[PDB]
């Protein structure tokens, strides 16, 4: 019911599932049957790249893309991992990981106080599609401490023109 469980620590103890499949007396290929999703972030959390994982875990790197979502892309993401970064960590192509971005992706960034031109050159292939994708709650979000003509702008765009769509008059000096 929970043998995951107990095999998901002897990854973090370092063993390979070669040694787990003898440790816990079983074999290589029921190994790979209880290696999930859960199993491959913690091997995303100490640096390994996926071809590492690939001679760790004895999956294909075509079975270990299987695994690997959007749920990594964040993670990485917001480390200090960038465009071109994360797609050679991952073995995927800069645009698989385009592919697997989205609007949560940009959120996190404004959580630490980079520009749309900062992360535009950061997750890499952006410019106006990250002004396209600024959500009205980014902008809503610093309705606490608005305060720019267009630098409240800036870190979302452009000037007012962005905080005209995205919110009222009233609030435009809230």
């Keep these: 019911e929970e ?7 002897l990854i973090e103890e370092g063993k390979t599932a070669e040694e787990i499949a003898e440790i816990l007396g079983l074999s290589v290929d029921e190994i790979k049957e209880l290696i999930g999703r859960r199993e491959v972030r913690e091997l995303i959390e100490e640096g390994k790249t996926a071809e590492e994982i690939a001679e760790i875990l004895g999956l294909s790197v075509d079975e270990i893309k299987e695994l690997i979502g959007r749920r990594e892309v964040r993670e990485l993401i917001e480390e200090g991992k960038t465009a071109e970064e994360i797609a050679e960590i991952l073995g995927l192509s800069v645009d698989e990981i385009k592919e697997l ?15 749309a031109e900062e992360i535009a050159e950061i997750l890499g292939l952006s410019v106006d599609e990250i002004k396209e994708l600024i959500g009205r709650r980014e902008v809503r979000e610093l309705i606490e401490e608005g305060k720019t003509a267009e630098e409240i702008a800036e870190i979302l765009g452009l000037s007012v023109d962005e905080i005209k769509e ?3 008059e009233e609030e435009i000096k809230k």
Excluded: F, N
């Excluded at 043998?3 to 620590?9: K, P, T, Y």
């Excluded at 609007?103 to 106080?113: A, D, H, Y």
């Design 3 to 9: 043998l995951r469980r107990e095999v998901r620590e």
């Design 101 to 115: 971005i989205g609007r949560r992706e940009v959120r996190e960034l404004i959580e630490e106080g980079k520009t």
């Design 166 to 168: 995205l919110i009222g």
